[PDB]
């Protein structure tokens, strides 16, 4: 169990631009692991689980933060979607299935599976089927889950493995786009339509980051979240946004960077790959237009290199290849060195 400072250091290498959220996740996840490290709990006092709540825009790195922690401290990791449970029919079967999926990666070990880190996204959508929250809160409370061992054609009722979710860390991520307005109404001037009202919607998005940090339970109930569900999520980490400059960094700075990944594929081919600084902003510009954050970066670069990947093997004696902003736009073809 590395220290909270150490956890943040490892997260910095994999993710960037979420230093504040990283601190909240680092200290919170550290305490939960420390609670597991001190799982004996010989004293009568029993420590309580601290569930984290991630609030950030799409493609901001919510999911990446989940698996990155599991990679550092080997533990099973599973993802889930609230939209899948919107049906509100036999919700119990679906939620226990999340544990079955986790057990697949945990070698069907109750002890190892209990230490897993579960992640959920699109929580704002369920807020208003109200029934799913009634059932979902029970999962966060911690309850035994009967799961059959390694599938099986048939097994006795007692044979079913029992896993207690009290020791599992749940991260209910979400993206509350409309919550910023609720906070401004409570913190800033109530007027939003008058001449004096601040309607300067420049779309810079810098102000929203600070505004979301002031999230309180009052704004959540207005959004439709029930108070009981809010209480079980004491820890809250807020991701403001991924900047255009930050997007350029994400392209190359992360360990498993997109440029490094493509460079590796081209490196084994025998041709060097280069990306000019102007080319990097072009990818960021195209990505920002898509509004998918860092997710769009993979598609933009893939399309740019689709044509060269098809023809470069046919070409012989190509010592190196270079890419510029024009190439990303598609008007030009990447330079070829021989």
């Amino acid at each position: 169990l590395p220290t909270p400072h150490e956890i943040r250091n490892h997260l910095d290498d994999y993710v960037i631009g979420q230093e504040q959220a990283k601190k909240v996740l680092a200290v919170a996840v550290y305490n939960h692991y420390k609670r597991l490290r001190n799982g004996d709990t010989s004293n009568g006092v029993e420590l309580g689980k601290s569930n984290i709540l991630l609030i950030g825009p799409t493609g901001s790195g919510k999911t990446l933060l989940a698996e990155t922690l599991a990679r550092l401290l080997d533990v099973p990791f599973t993802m889930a979607d609230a939209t899948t449970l919107t049906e509100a029919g036999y919700v119990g079967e679906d939620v226990e299935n999340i544990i079955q999926k986790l057990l697949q990666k945990s070698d069907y070990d109750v002890q190892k599976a209990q230490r897993g880190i579960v992640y959920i996204d699109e929580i704002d959508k369920i807020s208003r089927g109200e029934g799913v929250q009634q059932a979902l809160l029970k999962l966060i409370e911690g309850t035994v889950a009967a799961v059959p061992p390694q599938g099986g054609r048939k097994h006795p009722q007692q044979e079913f493995l029992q896993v207690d979710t009290s020791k599992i860390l749940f991260i209910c991520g979400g993206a509350f786009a409309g919550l910023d307005k609720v906070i401004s109404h409570r913190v800033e001037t109530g007027s939003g339509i008058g001449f004096g009202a601040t309607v300067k919607a420049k779309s810079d998005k810098a102000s929203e980051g600070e505004l979301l940090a002031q999230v309180e339970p009052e704004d959540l109930i207005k959004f439709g979240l029930i108070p009981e569900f809010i209480g079980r999520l004491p820890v809250v980490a807020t991701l403001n946004e991924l900047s255009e400059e930050a997007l350029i960094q994400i392209l190359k700075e992360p360990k498993n960077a997109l440029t490094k990944q493509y460079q590796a594929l081209f490196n084994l081919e025998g041709v060097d790959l280069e990306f000019r600084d102007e080319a990097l902003d072009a990818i960021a510009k195209k990505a920002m237009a898509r509004k998918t954050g860092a997710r769009g970066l993979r598609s933009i670069v893939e399309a740019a290199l689709l044509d060269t990947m098809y023809d470069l093997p046919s070409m012989e004696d190509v010592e190196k290849v270079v890419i510029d902003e024009s190439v990303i736009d598609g008007q030009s073809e990447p330079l070829l060195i021989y």
Partner: protein, 191 residues
């Protein structure tokens, strides 16, 4: 026919008239000749907004060629009585009664559009009857004149003597002139 606007929030969708939608934003529309009925409606809006939040500022759009003096005092006294600062924005014009309410706004929260026209004059009244009754009403309207001039001098900051000479007859003013005179604080040219 006033149009209907739909407000969309997480809880649901609600339909409101254009005037009621802006009321949620602490925006009151003072329009037409001032009278007891319209003034009572504006007063109800001020008290309602005060109850919802006594800290947020209230905006008042003034466009009116004056009106009944008694009805105007109800609005003026109400604005000063309630804790929230009542901002005043002049749209189109602001005559004697409209100007009194305009300058009555909270210090530093009085605005006017660039092409607005502000006119100030002394009270107008009349009475028919016996000479004894005339003296009673003549003294009453004169007291109102001195009282209004004193109040205007306080908000504008001009001396009472200066206000008396200027308000003896109709004095049309422009947005820049109002700023130096003291009726308004600044002009809202662009956003």
């Amino acid at each position: 026919l006033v149009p209907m606007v739909i407000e969309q929030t997480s809880r649901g969708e609600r339909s409101f008239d254009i005037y009621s939608r802006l009321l949620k934003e602490r925006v009151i529309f003072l329009t037409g000749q001032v009278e007891d009925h319209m003034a009572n409606l504006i007063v109800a809006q001020m008290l309602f907004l005060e109850a919802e939040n006594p800290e947020k500022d209230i905006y008042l759009y003034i466009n009116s060629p004056g009106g009944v003096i008694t009805a105007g005092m109800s609005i003026y006294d109400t604005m000063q009585f309630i804790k929230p600062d009542v901002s005043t924005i002049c749209m189109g014009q602001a005559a004697s009664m409209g100007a009194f309410l305009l300058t009555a706004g909270a210090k530093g929260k009085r605005f006017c559009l660039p092409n607005s026209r502000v006119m100030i004059h002394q009270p107008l009244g009349g009475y028919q009857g016996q000479a004894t009754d005339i003296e009673i009403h003549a003294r009453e309207i004169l007291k109102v004149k001195g009282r209004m001039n004193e109040l205007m001098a306080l908000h504008t900051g001009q001396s009472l003597e200066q206000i008396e000479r200027d308000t003896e007859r109709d004095r049309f003013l422009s947005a820049p002139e109002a700023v130096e005179y003291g009726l308004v604080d600044s002009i809202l040219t662009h956003r």
